[PDB]
Amino acid sequence: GSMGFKVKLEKRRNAINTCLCIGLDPDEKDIENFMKNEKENNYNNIKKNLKEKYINNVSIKKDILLKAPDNIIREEKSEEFFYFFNHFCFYIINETNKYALTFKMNFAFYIPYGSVGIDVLKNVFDYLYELNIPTILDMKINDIGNTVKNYRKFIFEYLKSDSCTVNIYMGTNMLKDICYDEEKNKYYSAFVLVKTTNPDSAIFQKNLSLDNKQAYVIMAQEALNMSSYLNLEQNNEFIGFVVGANSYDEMNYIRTYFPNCYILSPGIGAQNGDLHKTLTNGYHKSYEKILINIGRAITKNPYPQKAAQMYYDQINAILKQNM
Amino acid sequence: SMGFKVKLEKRRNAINTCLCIGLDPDEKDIENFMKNEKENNYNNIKKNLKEKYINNVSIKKDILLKAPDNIIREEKSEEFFYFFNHFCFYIINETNKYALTFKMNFAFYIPYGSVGIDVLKNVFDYLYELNIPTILDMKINDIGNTVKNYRKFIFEYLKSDSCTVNIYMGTNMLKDICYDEEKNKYYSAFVLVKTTNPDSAIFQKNLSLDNKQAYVIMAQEALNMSSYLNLEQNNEFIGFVVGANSYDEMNYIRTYFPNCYILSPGIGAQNGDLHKTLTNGYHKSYEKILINIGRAITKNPYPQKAAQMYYDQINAILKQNM
Ligand SMILES: *c1cc(=O)[nH]c(=O)n1[C@@H]1O[C@H](COP(=O)(O)O)[C@@H](O)[C@H]1O
Ligand SMILES: *c1cc(=O)[nH]c(=O)n1[C@@H]1O[C@H](COP(=O)(O)O)[C@@H](O)[C@H]1O
């Protein structure tokens, strides 16, 4: 893993020929359903997880993770939730990774049980790192410089994430303490929020303006200005933009006015975005520049390998059309 | 269980301040506590051990209750957990008598992985036992389905009284942060309005709508959402984060939203001016202007005295405004 995110994404894209970003946002029902299904089926999927060589290379509680499932429930009741949570994530990754340009894990899904889910998240990032699959930590972080450097450490040193999401409403100077580490002279990549998928996203992103430009345009320009100041792209890193898969006019504007920007686009599947429109409006011939994120539509499907294949094939068909 | 509004008003009646003590321990603070404690025969850990509510923390209590020499020899893997939690307990023990509320910034508790989240849980349990109003400062923002997870973590797991939120994505997220329809539960939040970072003008002031700077638009929309959720009827509220270094905005906000709740960081380490901030943001229900002080207390070698001086100063200024 000795290459910048820009180069890592380019190589993978060249290898697997897609821009599918698979979202791994397991909720409590997903974990419970997994536990239930595995008990009913002789734990087939966990046994398959246990086969995989890199499972021996994760950091946290291997002594538990590598135990036989029927042992967990019988002798390790307190470690049960950790075990089934972690094995669910490993299962999704094992089934879908061959279709994924990148995986994006949203931090919110890993925190609500306290420390246990952060052990899971750490093992998920360790695992993806070993598989050499590009990663995004979706955490829409924001704070003053002194405070955000703690997120930089968590995300880029502890998890060894390739990138993260950031909300720059507080200002762009925070990026100096996220995309750059002055002590180590390391650079990192991020996606800043530009236009989001929530139904009332226009209220600030579009209604606020300076002169005749809407906030989302100003914010995108300011992010880019900070990327140039930081020399990110000279260091094979970048600041890109989050633009929702339902925001078809904004996607078109962003791609038109910032031709070579990297775009991360959530909102397909569960949130009902239009894939043809989104992919067409954000298209770049280096299509790692238009990451299409699909979470629940893959992870909540009874056969996530087949779900990921469907989206992979659907995307590639639209990619072929754009040519 | 009466609501944050009531908790704040009642604590203010008991202690007569609006000091909010920030508990943001960094690695150097934990390491420096560990060093000091060794050099003074664990004077402060010994004191921590003699307090009643240590016996009520949820996570690894046995470990916390052990003597420091028994940890260092027999539980070395728990050493960092032990010293991190005991630094937090020490600050709380030395300063809580002066605090209207404690604010913990999440960022300080995550960068070592899970260990600091167990610490954070124990901290919130300890504060809850002492009846001290709490704020989790995490500046959350996401789509509704996602932020429900932060509602659970913050308000069900930590049992925080409130949190901070960034509503730049939109205000609708607040329905899944300050309200739980299924359980009929209501919670309080402070939204970012004007922040302390040097370049905060870039979007907060330079963007506008109608004839008003963005920070005013955002404050108004947050209040619109608060009334839609009927928080104040359930003794909760949506309040504003306004920097202690942002006098014009504080003045504008206090003038145009007369009865709003304001959280004001930026005094001490970030150089705000306590007198101007407190005058410009003043309200006679002064739990409505919480002055946050983090590093100027936690990085002071005599933190009880540092809290005391802020308390005394706030009180003399609160006297001036009558
Ligand atoms: C972040 C920003 C945004 O505008 N929209 C979003 O949905 N998100 C995050 O992206 C993921 C969507 O997943 P799904 O709808 O495919 O399940 C999720 O992590 C959300 O927080
Ligand atoms: C949040 C928003 C803001 O505008 N300014 C801030 O400083 N913060 C947070 O408040 C705390 C300040 O602590 P200190 O400067 O007294 O140490 C800290 O948690 C920061 O993230």
PDB file of C-alpha atoms in Angstrom, chain B residues 12-244:
ATOM      1  CA  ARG B  12     -28.100  27.460  37.583  1.00  0.00           C
ATOM      2  CA  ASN B  13     -30.333  28.055  40.652  1.00  0.00           C
ATOM      3  CA  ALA B  14     -27.995  25.831  42.676  1.00  0.00           C
ATOM      4  CA  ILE B  15     -24.598  27.071  41.539  1.00  0.00           C
ATOM      5  CA  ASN B  16     -25.197  30.530  39.982  1.00  0.00           C
ATOM      6  CA  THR B  17     -22.881  30.354  36.986  1.00  0.00           C
ATOM      7  CA  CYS B  18     -22.848  29.719  33.268  1.00  0.00           C
ATOM      8  CA  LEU B  19     -19.393  28.178  33.098  1.00  0.00           C
ATOM      9  CA  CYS B  20     -19.292  25.129  30.782  1.00  0.00           C
ATOM     10  CA  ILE B  21     -16.133  23.115  31.390  1.00  0.00           C
ATOM     11  CA  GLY B  22     -14.731  21.448  28.255  1.00  0.00           C
ATOM     12  CA  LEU B  23     -13.144  18.059  28.766  1.00  0.00           C
ATOM     13  CA  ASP B  24     -10.969  17.471  25.651  1.00  0.00           C
ATOM     14  CA  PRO B  25      -7.948  15.446  26.869  1.00  0.00           C
ATOM     15  CA  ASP B  26      -5.228  14.984  24.290  1.00  0.00           C
ATOM     16  CA  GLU B  27      -2.434  12.371  24.273  1.00  0.00           C
ATOM     17  CA  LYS B  28       0.010  14.806  25.895  1.00  0.00           C
ATOM     18  CA  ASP B  29      -2.490  15.466  28.744  1.00  0.00           C
ATOM     19  CA  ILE B  30      -2.870  11.750  29.422  1.00  0.00           C
ATOM     20  CA  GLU B  31       0.872  11.139  29.226  1.00  0.00           C
ATOM     21  CA  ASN B  32       1.589  14.179  31.458  1.00  0.00           C
ATOM     22  CA  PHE B  33      -0.960  12.963  34.045  1.00  0.00           C
ATOM     23  CA  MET B  34       0.686   9.507  34.041  1.00  0.00           C
ATOM     24  CA  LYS B  35       4.124  11.073  34.582  1.00  0.00           C
ATOM     25  CA  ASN B  36       2.981  13.513  37.305  1.00  0.00           C
ATOM     26  CA  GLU B  37       1.086  10.819  39.187  1.00  0.00           C
ATOM     27  CA  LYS B  38       4.154   8.575  39.318  1.00  0.00           C
ATOM     28  CA  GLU B  39       6.186  11.550  40.580  1.00  0.00           C
ATOM     29  CA  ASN B  40       3.729  12.324  43.369  1.00  0.00           C
ATOM     30  CA  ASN B  41       2.888   8.804  44.553  1.00  0.00           C
ATOM     31  CA  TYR B  42      -0.419   8.773  42.666  1.00  0.00           C
ATOM     32  CA  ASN B  43      -1.911  11.503  44.867  1.00  0.00           C
ATOM     33  CA  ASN B  44      -4.759  12.260  42.466  1.00  0.00           C
ATOM     34  CA  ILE B  45      -5.627   8.687  41.576  1.00  0.00           C
ATOM     35  CA  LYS B  46      -5.772   7.942  45.310  1.00  0.00           C
ATOM     36  CA  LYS B  47      -8.264  10.818  45.675  1.00  0.00           C
ATOM     37  CA  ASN B  48     -10.320   9.575  42.720  1.00  0.00           C
ATOM     38  CA  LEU B  49     -10.503   6.159  44.346  1.00  0.00           C
ATOM     39  CA  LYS B  50     -12.100   7.646  47.476  1.00  0.00           C
ATOM     40  CA  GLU B  51     -15.088   9.203  45.651  1.00  0.00           C
ATOM     41  CA  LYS B  52     -18.498   7.485  45.873  1.00  0.00           C
ATOM     42  CA  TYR B  53     -19.568   7.448  42.215  1.00  0.00           C
ATOM     43  CA  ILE B  54     -16.501   5.672  40.867  1.00  0.00           C
ATOM     44  CA  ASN B  55     -18.332   2.556  42.104  1.00  0.00           C
ATOM     45  CA  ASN B  56     -21.104   3.274  39.595  1.00  0.00           C
ATOM     46  CA  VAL B  57     -19.221   3.354  36.261  1.00  0.00           C
ATOM     47  CA  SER B  58     -20.281   0.789  33.647  1.00  0.00           C
ATOM     48  CA  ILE B  59     -17.087  -0.290  31.945  1.00  0.00           C
ATOM     49  CA  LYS B  60     -14.137  -2.127  33.464  1.00  0.00           C
ATOM     50  CA  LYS B  61     -14.957  -0.861  36.956  1.00  0.00           C
ATOM     51  CA  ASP B  62     -12.834  -3.566  38.566  1.00  0.00           C
ATOM     52  CA  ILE B  63      -9.865  -2.279  36.601  1.00  0.00           C
ATOM     53  CA  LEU B  64     -10.491   1.371  37.565  1.00  0.00           C
ATOM     54  CA  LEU B  65     -10.752   0.481  41.264  1.00  0.00           C
ATOM     55  CA  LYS B  66      -7.317  -1.242  41.350  1.00  0.00           C
ATOM     56  CA  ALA B  67      -4.229   0.499  42.750  1.00  0.00           C
ATOM     57  CA  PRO B  68      -1.892   2.063  40.144  1.00  0.00           C
ATOM     58  CA  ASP B  69       1.016  -0.273  41.028  1.00  0.00           C
ATOM     59  CA  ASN B  70      -1.235  -3.323  40.539  1.00  0.00           C
ATOM     60  CA  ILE B  71      -2.208  -2.026  37.069  1.00  0.00           C
ATOM     61  CA  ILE B  72       1.361  -1.301  36.019  1.00  0.00           C
ATOM     62  CA  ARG B  73       2.557  -4.803  36.965  1.00  0.00           C
ATOM     63  CA  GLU B  74      -0.526  -6.988  36.436  1.00  0.00           C
ATOM     64  CA  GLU B  75      -2.746  -5.146  33.946  1.00  0.00           C
ATOM     65  CA  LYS B  76      -0.312  -3.394  31.596  1.00  0.00           C
ATOM     66  CA  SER B  77      -2.650  -3.644  28.599  1.00  0.00           C
ATOM     67  CA  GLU B  78      -5.201  -1.604  30.652  1.00  0.00           C
ATOM     68  CA  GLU B  79      -2.702   1.061  31.683  1.00  0.00           C
ATOM     69  CA  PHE B  80      -3.669   3.606  29.011  1.00  0.00           C
ATOM     70  CA  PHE B  81      -7.392   3.062  29.651  1.00  0.00           C
ATOM     71  CA  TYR B  82      -6.736   3.399  33.381  1.00  0.00           C
ATOM     72  CA  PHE B  83      -4.768   6.664  33.205  1.00  0.00           C
ATOM     73  CA  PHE B  84      -7.010   8.195  30.531  1.00  0.00           C
ATOM     74  CA  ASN B  85     -10.147   7.507  32.599  1.00  0.00           C
ATOM     75  CA  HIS B  86      -8.474   8.706  35.824  1.00  0.00           C
ATOM     76  CA  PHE B  87      -7.337  11.944  34.189  1.00  0.00           C
ATOM     77  CA  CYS B  88     -10.976  12.607  33.206  1.00  0.00           C
ATOM     78  CA  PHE B  89     -12.225  11.670  36.656  1.00  0.00           C
ATOM     79  CA  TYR B  90      -9.577  13.920  38.226  1.00  0.00           C
ATOM     80  CA  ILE B  91     -10.594  16.947  36.178  1.00  0.00           C
ATOM     81  CA  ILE B  92     -14.280  16.372  36.936  1.00  0.00           C
ATOM     82  CA  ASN B  93     -13.579  15.875  40.652  1.00  0.00           C
ATOM     83  CA  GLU B  94     -11.451  19.021  40.879  1.00  0.00           C
ATOM     84  CA  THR B  95     -13.775  21.280  38.871  1.00  0.00           C
ATOM     85  CA  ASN B  96     -17.387  20.075  38.903  1.00  0.00           C
ATOM     86  CA  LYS B  97     -18.515  22.366  41.741  1.00  0.00           C
ATOM     87  CA  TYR B  98     -17.951  25.324  39.410  1.00  0.00           C
ATOM     88  CA  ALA B  99     -19.559  23.868  36.266  1.00  0.00           C
ATOM     89  CA  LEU B 100     -23.080  24.493  34.998  1.00  0.00           C
ATOM     90  CA  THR B 101     -22.399  21.845  32.337  1.00  0.00           C
ATOM     91  CA  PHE B 102     -19.555  19.711  30.969  1.00  0.00           C
ATOM     92  CA  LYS B 103     -18.928  19.456  27.243  1.00  0.00           C
ATOM     93  CA  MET B 104     -16.913  16.520  25.923  1.00  0.00           C
ATOM     94  CA  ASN B 105     -15.614  16.710  22.353  1.00  0.00           C
ATOM     95  CA  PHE B 106     -15.942  13.305  20.733  1.00  0.00           C
ATOM     96  CA  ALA B 107     -12.820  13.787  18.602  1.00  0.00           C
ATOM     97  CA  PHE B 108     -10.571  13.425  21.670  1.00  0.00           C
ATOM     98  CA  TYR B 109     -12.065  10.057  22.586  1.00  0.00           C
ATOM     99  CA  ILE B 110     -11.796   8.236  19.219  1.00  0.00           C
ATOM    100  CA  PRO B 111      -8.188   8.411  17.943  1.00  0.00           C
ATOM    101  CA  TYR B 112      -6.917   5.374  19.902  1.00  0.00           C
ATOM    102  CA  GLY B 113      -9.818   3.214  18.708  1.00  0.00           C
ATOM    103  CA  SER B 114     -12.346   1.627  21.050  1.00  0.00           C
ATOM    104  CA  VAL B 115     -10.458   2.212  24.268  1.00  0.00           C
ATOM    105  CA  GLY B 116     -11.323   5.940  24.405  1.00  0.00           C
ATOM    106  CA  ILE B 117     -14.998   5.246  23.773  1.00  0.00           C
ATOM    107  CA  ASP B 118     -15.143   3.079  26.894  1.00  0.00           C
ATOM    108  CA  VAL B 119     -13.502   6.047  28.690  1.00  0.00           C
ATOM    109  CA  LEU B 120     -16.150   8.392  27.182  1.00  0.00           C
ATOM    110  CA  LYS B 121     -19.003   6.128  28.357  1.00  0.00           C
ATOM    111  CA  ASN B 122     -17.560   6.041  31.895  1.00  0.00           C
ATOM    112  CA  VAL B 123     -17.239   9.841  31.838  1.00  0.00           C
ATOM    113  CA  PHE B 124     -20.906  10.301  30.884  1.00  0.00           C
ATOM    114  CA  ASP B 125     -21.993   7.730  33.486  1.00  0.00           C
ATOM    115  CA  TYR B 126     -19.993   9.591  36.156  1.00  0.00           C
ATOM    116  CA  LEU B 127     -21.455  12.972  35.210  1.00  0.00           C
ATOM    117  CA  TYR B 128     -24.944  11.433  35.106  1.00  0.00           C
ATOM    118  CA  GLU B 129     -24.422  10.098  38.638  1.00  0.00           C
ATOM    119  CA  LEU B 130     -23.401  13.618  39.756  1.00  0.00           C
ATOM    120  CA  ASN B 131     -26.481  15.152  38.082  1.00  0.00           C
ATOM    121  CA  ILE B 132     -24.315  17.478  35.954  1.00  0.00           C
ATOM    122  CA  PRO B 133     -25.864  18.562  32.644  1.00  0.00           C
ATOM    123  CA  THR B 134     -23.905  17.264  29.648  1.00  0.00           C
ATOM    124  CA  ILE B 135     -23.100  18.167  26.065  1.00  0.00           C
ATOM    125  CA  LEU B 136     -21.488  15.844  23.514  1.00  0.00           C
ATOM    126  CA  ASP B 137     -19.669  18.002  21.018  1.00  0.00           C
ATOM    127  CA  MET B 138     -19.450  16.053  17.782  1.00  0.00           C
ATOM    128  CA  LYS B 139     -20.906  18.482  15.194  1.00  0.00           C
ATOM    129  CA  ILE B 140     -22.918  15.597  13.609  1.00  0.00           C
ATOM    130  CA  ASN B 141     -24.457  15.865  10.165  1.00  0.00           C
ATOM    131  CA  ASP B 142     -25.947  13.255   7.828  1.00  0.00           C
ATOM    132  CA  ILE B 143     -29.150  12.104   6.142  1.00  0.00           C
ATOM    133  CA  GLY B 144     -31.951  11.003   8.470  1.00  0.00           C
ATOM    134  CA  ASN B 145     -31.527   7.221   8.354  1.00  0.00           C
ATOM    135  CA  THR B 146     -27.875   7.652   9.240  1.00  0.00           C
ATOM    136  CA  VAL B 147     -28.081  10.271  12.014  1.00  0.00           C
ATOM    137  CA  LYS B 148     -30.547   8.012  13.897  1.00  0.00           C
ATOM    138  CA  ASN B 149     -27.418   6.073  14.873  1.00  0.00           C
ATOM    139  CA  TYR B 150     -25.944   9.209  16.471  1.00  0.00           C
ATOM    140  CA  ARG B 151     -29.243   9.799  18.280  1.00  0.00           C
ATOM    141  CA  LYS B 152     -28.914   6.326  19.751  1.00  0.00           C
ATOM    142  CA  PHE B 153     -25.224   6.679  20.625  1.00  0.00           C
ATOM    143  CA  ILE B 154     -25.560  10.125  22.147  1.00  0.00           C
ATOM    144  CA  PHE B 155     -28.961  10.098  23.833  1.00  0.00           C
ATOM    145  CA  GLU B 156     -29.530   6.418  24.597  1.00  0.00           C
ATOM    146  CA  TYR B 157     -26.026   4.983  25.057  1.00  0.00           C
ATOM    147  CA  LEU B 158     -24.135   7.945  26.644  1.00  0.00           C
ATOM    148  CA  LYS B 159     -27.400   9.384  27.965  1.00  0.00           C
ATOM    149  CA  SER B 160     -26.174  12.863  27.083  1.00  0.00           C
ATOM    150  CA  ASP B 161     -28.469  15.830  27.647  1.00  0.00           C
ATOM    151  CA  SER B 162     -27.484  17.464  24.367  1.00  0.00           C
ATOM    152  CA  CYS B 163     -25.123  17.533  21.395  1.00  0.00           C
ATOM    153  CA  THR B 164     -23.791  19.855  18.728  1.00  0.00           C
ATOM    154  CA  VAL B 165     -24.960  19.582  15.110  1.00  0.00           C
ATOM    155  CA  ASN B 166     -23.888  21.062  11.784  1.00  0.00           C
ATOM    156  CA  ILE B 167     -27.098  21.784   9.785  1.00  0.00           C
ATOM    157  CA  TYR B 168     -25.430  22.877   6.550  1.00  0.00           C
ATOM    158  CA  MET B 169     -26.819  19.686   4.884  1.00  0.00           C
ATOM    159  CA  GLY B 170     -30.311  20.821   5.942  1.00  0.00           C
ATOM    160  CA  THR B 171     -32.517  21.148   9.009  1.00  0.00           C
ATOM    161  CA  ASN B 172     -34.621  18.038   8.390  1.00  0.00           C
ATOM    162  CA  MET B 173     -31.872  15.923  10.028  1.00  0.00           C
ATOM    163  CA  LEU B 174     -32.882  17.441  13.377  1.00  0.00           C
ATOM    164  CA  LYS B 175     -36.121  15.396  13.322  1.00  0.00           C
ATOM    165  CA  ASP B 176     -33.932  12.299  13.692  1.00  0.00           C
ATOM    166  CA  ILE B 177     -31.572  13.826  16.278  1.00  0.00           C
ATOM    167  CA  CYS B 178     -33.802  15.869  18.646  1.00  0.00           C
ATOM    168  CA  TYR B 179     -36.855  13.589  18.366  1.00  0.00           C
ATOM    169  CA  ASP B 180     -37.611   9.883  18.533  1.00  0.00           C
ATOM    170  CA  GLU B 181     -41.149   9.384  17.210  1.00  0.00           C
ATOM    171  CA  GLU B 182     -41.306   5.692  18.177  1.00  0.00           C
ATOM    172  CA  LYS B 183     -40.455   6.389  21.841  1.00  0.00           C
ATOM    173  CA  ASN B 184     -41.921   9.902  22.124  1.00  0.00           C
ATOM    174  CA  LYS B 185     -38.513  11.194  23.319  1.00  0.00           C
ATOM    175  CA  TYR B 186     -37.174  14.721  22.845  1.00  0.00           C
ATOM    176  CA  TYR B 187     -33.570  15.926  23.039  1.00  0.00           C
ATOM    177  CA  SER B 188     -31.701  19.206  22.834  1.00  0.00           C
ATOM    178  CA  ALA B 189     -29.015  20.363  20.398  1.00  0.00           C
ATOM    179  CA  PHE B 190     -26.846  23.347  19.639  1.00  0.00           C
ATOM    180  CA  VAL B 191     -26.353  24.130  15.929  1.00  0.00           C
ATOM    181  CA  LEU B 192     -23.297  25.821  14.439  1.00  0.00           C
ATOM    182  CA  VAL B 193     -24.096  29.465  13.755  1.00  0.00           C
ATOM    183  CA  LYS B 194     -20.798  31.390  14.002  1.00  0.00           C
ATOM    184  CA  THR B 195     -17.585  29.433  14.712  1.00  0.00           C
ATOM    185  CA  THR B 196     -14.229  30.482  16.215  1.00  0.00           C
ATOM    186  CA  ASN B 197     -11.801  29.377  13.481  1.00  0.00           C
ATOM    187  CA  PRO B 198      -9.977  32.264  11.821  1.00  0.00           C
ATOM    188  CA  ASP B 199     -11.546  31.756   8.386  1.00  0.00           C
ATOM    189  CA  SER B 200     -15.113  31.318   9.646  1.00  0.00           C
ATOM    190  CA  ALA B 201     -16.314  34.326   7.589  1.00  0.00           C
ATOM    191  CA  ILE B 202     -15.835  32.465   4.284  1.00  0.00           C
ATOM    192  CA  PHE B 203     -19.248  30.821   4.284  1.00  0.00           C
ATOM    193  CA  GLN B 204     -20.876  32.046   7.501  1.00  0.00           C
ATOM    194  CA  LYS B 205     -20.680  35.775   6.673  1.00  0.00           C
ATOM    195  CA  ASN B 206     -19.765  36.091   2.992  1.00  0.00           C
ATOM    196  CA  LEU B 207     -22.739  33.994   1.826  1.00  0.00           C
ATOM    197  CA  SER B 208     -26.182  35.570   2.197  1.00  0.00           C
ATOM    198  CA  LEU B 209     -29.875  35.414   1.408  1.00  0.00           C
ATOM    199  CA  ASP B 210     -32.385  38.190   1.322  1.00  0.00           C
ATOM    200  CA  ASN B 211     -30.575  40.748   3.262  1.00  0.00           C
ATOM    201  CA  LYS B 212     -28.980  38.602   5.840  1.00  0.00           C
ATOM    202  CA  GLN B 213     -25.641  36.847   6.286  1.00  0.00           C
ATOM    203  CA  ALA B 214     -25.715  33.081   6.231  1.00  0.00           C
ATOM    204  CA  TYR B 215     -25.302  32.724   9.998  1.00  0.00           C
ATOM    205  CA  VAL B 216     -28.601  34.571  10.518  1.00  0.00           C
ATOM    206  CA  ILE B 217     -30.433  32.374   7.963  1.00  0.00           C
ATOM    207  CA  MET B 218     -29.125  29.228   9.628  1.00  0.00           C
ATOM    208  CA  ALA B 219     -30.084  30.447  13.155  1.00  0.00           C
ATOM    209  CA  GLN B 220     -33.616  31.251  11.940  1.00  0.00           C
ATOM    210  CA  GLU B 221     -34.068  27.885  10.176  1.00  0.00           C
ATOM    211  CA  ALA B 222     -32.923  26.037  13.308  1.00  0.00           C
ATOM    212  CA  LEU B 223     -35.551  27.833  15.384  1.00  0.00           C
ATOM    213  CA  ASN B 224     -38.213  27.076  12.740  1.00  0.00           C
ATOM    214  CA  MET B 225     -37.304  23.398  13.049  1.00  0.00           C
ATOM    215  CA  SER B 226     -37.376  23.577  16.859  1.00  0.00           C
ATOM    216  CA  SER B 227     -40.971  24.834  16.842  1.00  0.00           C
ATOM    217  CA  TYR B 228     -42.007  22.244  14.253  1.00  0.00           C
ATOM    218  CA  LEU B 229     -40.665  19.510  16.621  1.00  0.00           C
ATOM    219  CA  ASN B 230     -42.278  21.244  19.631  1.00  0.00           C
ATOM    220  CA  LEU B 231     -39.117  20.884  21.716  1.00  0.00           C
ATOM    221  CA  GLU B 232     -39.724  23.770  24.111  1.00  0.00           C
ATOM    222  CA  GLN B 233     -43.127  22.250  25.036  1.00  0.00           C
ATOM    223  CA  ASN B 234     -41.169  19.157  25.981  1.00  0.00           C
ATOM    224  CA  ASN B 235     -38.599  21.231  27.836  1.00  0.00           C
ATOM    225  CA  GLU B 236     -35.886  20.780  25.226  1.00  0.00           C
ATOM    226  CA  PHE B 237     -34.494  23.286  22.762  1.00  0.00           C
ATOM    227  CA  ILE B 238     -32.381  23.947  19.715  1.00  0.00           C
ATOM    228  CA  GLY B 239     -29.685  26.492  20.586  1.00  0.00           C
ATOM    229  CA  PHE B 240     -26.796  28.152  18.792  1.00  0.00           C
ATOM    230  CA  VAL B 241     -23.025  27.872  18.792  1.00  0.00           C
ATOM    231  CA  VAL B 242     -21.670  31.432  18.607  1.00  0.00           C
ATOM    232  CA  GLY B 243     -17.935  31.993  19.067  1.00  0.00           C
ATOM    233  CA  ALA B 244     -16.724  33.931  22.101  1.00  0.00           C
TER     234      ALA B 244
END
